[model samples]
Target: KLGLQILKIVMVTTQLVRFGLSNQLVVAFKEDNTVAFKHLFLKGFSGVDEDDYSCSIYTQENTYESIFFAIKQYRHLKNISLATLGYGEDNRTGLKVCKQHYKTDSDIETDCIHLDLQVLTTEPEDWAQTSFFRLDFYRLVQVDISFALKGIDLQAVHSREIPDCYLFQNTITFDNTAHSGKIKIYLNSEANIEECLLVFDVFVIMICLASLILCTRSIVLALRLRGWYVLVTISDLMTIIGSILKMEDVCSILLGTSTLFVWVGVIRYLGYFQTYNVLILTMQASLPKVLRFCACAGMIYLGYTFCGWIVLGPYHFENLNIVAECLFSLVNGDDMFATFAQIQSILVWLFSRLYLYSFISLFIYMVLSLFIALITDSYHTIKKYQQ
Candidate 1:
């Protein structure tokens, strides 16, 4: 007597791989009998061409008995060979069996099988035209089991709701094992509309064109003035160039530096109002003291930033760019202490804490206080002159 066993089954799709019938049996047959033991298992997409389908079977075994069993089952018992089934035009359908013995003297047993299939469609490019496809695996005996499908591309269709018959990327996993249930895929024209929206960018192109025209005018006027206005206009021109050219980093610095001189242009226009002109004159008179304060404060802030880069270099401040970002965040009073709590090293944490304290004390508390005082003095001086 001979008994058959299936160890494992795997199915590969275009996008993903799946395992089927893991340690499960598909059939059991006697040694000397040609009786049908099981039905042919079928799995595939519906609404496809018959010529586009091809299958190949592979088998491996350690003993002669199992090899003989595989040949009998596929070639003789069921007449499923490439020659008999008329699928052998390019040697597409065939079987392979290895009958090598195990290295040890003890008895060894192993069985492996694979089936490769292909189904060609007449209008392969037009998925809409190809329909009414089916995978037919006939069965002679009864066995209760279920099958599954996975890893299908769903982005190919653009519909509000997908049909039950079509296999999706993340959905449509389990289906019936029997050949009775036929899966149907519905074709729709809504996907064409969805695809069009993604390809066109009309709104963004229009905005860029408008900005370019305004920037051209600014550049021409700045050339004639040839002073601080030149920098502002050049900066605007750089921004428009960057947008059209898709440059990011270099253009970002150009735009940032341009913002500093923006106030210079506003001050130039301050002459229109007598009071505003007086306010500007008072601000200019106090500018030297403000610059001296900023110079002293800037030195202290730089010393703190350098110390932070060295002490916390390995743990947090890996490079100059990161150190600069951390130090600049102090201007907005961002919570650096919260990040310091996450560090495990005691020495690094202590240094980071000291750096944060000194930055807030000097830049935010002392410098801002002095700067506000100068601004208020200028405001009062301007009001006195106006009176």
Candidate 2:
């Protein structure tokens, strides 16, 4: 006889079953009050069996009614979720991943236990009364647990069954109906860092290119206005070439220093003409010579200071080898990299703006003075010849 029951529920415990014989039962009631039931006989089991049954029951006749019932049950289920936590250790415990430290139990302990009820049983007549499930506690160590239950939608499947292990496992489940998936977390691994470095190098090259263009145009114009032919001196040409070498790319420290000095010397020589005046030239020439001496002295002071700073001022370098070693060390060490870069930037800015500007100004002044002197000398000679 088919008789209808208002609710059906199954709750089984391993401690109660002897040789795991007795199974869980499921029952459904029809609209005409007819009952349908199924027994899921236990196949194999362990532990002592208890005749006493301790189970909970829930049911609804219509789909819409069940949904309303579920919404109401959701409020009560919050407490059940809270109670289910701290049941066991998480599944990621045994993973020995480098660069990723294992988080302790306290780390992953969150307030919510996610649940995903994908299918709801709606039929009243096709009922199963007895169901068997095996919970191997030993396998729990390998089990992955996760949660996502709020997004369920009605569909064809009679019921959705989730293993209880999922409650405490490291797995996360989501109802596909109400929500869409996305990439949540992304980390930049070693390859990504390398790619970033490549991009940065390209950007550096572009900036350097722009700077070179501006510097080259200004230098060319300066030379043309002064009526200087293409650079004739080997030293001058070598120095100019050296300046164009990328500072960061220049591997030979000796070459870099030598080239820098040669370029500076060539420019100084070119500017020497600006300091002389002929009528006033004799007087002005001596002054420019004094100024030139002062400039050379300053350059010498700077060179000495640079050497002294490397050797005696905190970072010591006994010779060229040690100096190069120190620079390499700075590049490798975090503290040294920041400190050296900051100090180097300041020094470059100061010298390029102040000393270089003064040197160029003096060069122009000397050239103008010499031009005026040439004119005065020509006029005086012509007047004497006429008399």
Candidate 3:
């Protein structure tokens, strides 16, 4: 005639000391052992049990208190550990749990665990549990529940569309909780599966594949022509490869040397230095080289400046100096209360947006303007060199 009981426990711990409570209900066992009990029955022995045979029962609500009291009673227990048993008050049951474990080894591995649990209103489904006694043995990461609506028609509060289904969610919590990162859910119609797969392919293969093929072709074409045209073709191949890979700084350096090779090819093929061809040949040779140098410079400035703005803005806000002092308080996410402070904060955001737009427009305008000026200047220089 062994008795059975159901208990639910809640425990909280700070440092190594644990404190908690459990709620328990005692029940009598029947003669018909064929019917599996929905609860657990434990026999306590002298409050002292072997490690393998260690079994105890306490009231479910304040189980932490019982465990702590038991630990104090037995000094041979050595150490006690406490973890979540995943039973909450509502029993409404839509819980999600995420767990991360850190090991003491050099090779660190992290995993995200998810579990789906549901409550059954009818005769309990296969995986559903009615009481906490049946759930303590499971190692669950997260618990999510799905419900199907039969005849209820729900309409949107602000719209006319009828909604028939909904999802309820709860997360299993943890002790010693640190910032374990985040999960972002998007309502997009499509997911980015291609980008995830592309991460596996080497970046060099994807970015430089076309450039490598084109460079080989250009090199072959250059090798067929003798003289300084050989240098011109090699430089084009280098510049093209760098440009395709978006290596702007490298391209700028290559283009600087490439400009010399290009002019040499112009002198050899266009034969400007060996003849008096003023407008056509002169403009073709020097004009393109000058434009290339200016284009590279403008690109280098734009790319570097964009990177600088993004990286430095946060750093600047954190470590603002004399001129940035007034702006620092506004950007630091402090309370903006007073009329003047609120006004200043609004103006700061407004001006920042306006400044970015104006600066980008000015940069584009200046680049176009520089291209025109460089073309005109190189045309004059080539004309003078020919004469």
Candidate 4:
């Protein structure tokens, strides 16, 4: 129904906004191959290093699977030891994670760094329950591997270059030579909140499907236009019709435009509310006064772009858009020192020096105050003529 459709539109749009404004940071697992521990289930392994290392492990489903931990070096050893391990916090403990060390003798304090998993004990022997989680377990495994480069290379690693990698996304074989530690990273979004959101995603799809059928019904009736109905029909139509083909290029384009139009469409409904209506009225009243300041603001600004272009080199003054941004940032005292430090100009008589100080003061004291005065004056006028 249109009523049901409108309700969903409002609810879903509100959810999107809530995601942006909410204080919670969405945690996601990303593999930065630039650093070590690029992805989970590492094989071919190469080696781990002498520098102390640590990383967060993301729990996939906690039910069970072997995450392969290995250290590969030929006919020699590096004595890397597990110093601290936890499910949540970075608490120091003698306990190491579990993966058997067999290929090289474990009894040797200085032996090959080849272990299937990591271990150990006493000061705090158990899953260190922070209790923030549901009493079972958390969604993370914290590992702190400790070592100091004490030379373990009778035959060190080779810097091999292979032609055209067959598999890319997650590497089965990865190597960083000369100075780096290699490990397997298997982190995932580690909170129950993600599950609720993930499960909620299911209902939204169903809600979308319901709208899809409604839109399809309109098509069966030959289709029409009047924004709300047309948008509800077509946007949903383009996307869901396109959804059948796994994923097509135009689906995203059509869908993105659909969302954009939907966002603009929402502004009309907002205008109906009194509080929002008053805010709108204030801005509408402010428009003439606001327009008056633009020219004054413009006159103050035109000089700076020229000044920066005139004094600074072509490198810093390249993008006109960024130049405008830099000048605007000057008004708010942002990147103040970077601007100062960037203009490492010659000790010339000081037009550039004067440019720096003058630009800072003129915007702060002159241009902004005039602009603020106009905006303030409009609000006073609005206050005089109340709803």
Top-lDDT candidate index: 4
Tell how far residue 156 is off in model 3, in angstroms.
Answer: 46
Which window of ten consecutive residues has the lowest lDDT sum in model 4?
147-156
Model 2, runs deviating above 4 Å: 1-227, 231-299, 310-312, 315-387
Candidate 1 is scored at a TM of 0.35
| Model 1 agreement with the true structure over 1-387: per-residue lDDT tens digits | 001000000001100111112101111112101121112222222223222121111211111222233333333323542211112211334332211222333443322222222221222423212221111223211111111111112322335444212111111111222335322211110100111121112222333344445555766876688843465345445434533443224534433343334445556566678867776677777889889888897787778778877877777677777777877786667756655664667776776677677777768777788899988887787778668
Q: Is candidate 2 or candidate 4 better by lDDT?
A: 4
State model 2's lDDT.
Answer: 0.30
Note the Cα lDDT for every prediction shown.
0.39, 0.30, 0.34, 0.44
- Give a tens-digit lDDT track for model 4, residues 1-387: 646666556655554454434322222111222123322223222354322222322343321222224222100122322211112211421212322222332231212121221322224422323222121222122222221111111111224332211111211221111112333333221122111053443444566678878767777676455334566655555444434332224544544555565665465458777777666667777787667777777776877886676657453566666778887887788878787666553553266678779888877888668777866887777776773
Which candidate achieves the best TM-score against the true structure?
A: 4
Candidate 3 lowest-lDDT run of ten: 1-10
User: Can you write out model 2's per-residue Cα lDDT over 31-55, one digit (the tens) per residue?
Assistant: 1111000010111111223222111
lDDT of 3 by residue, 273-310 (tens): 44535555556666566667667865765554554355
Q: In model 1, what lDDT does residue 102 have?
A: 29
How does each model score on TM-score? 0.35, 0.14, 0.26, 0.39
In model 3, which regions exceed 4 Å deviation? 1-182, 185-344, 357-361, 380-387
RMSD versus native structure for model 1 = 24.6
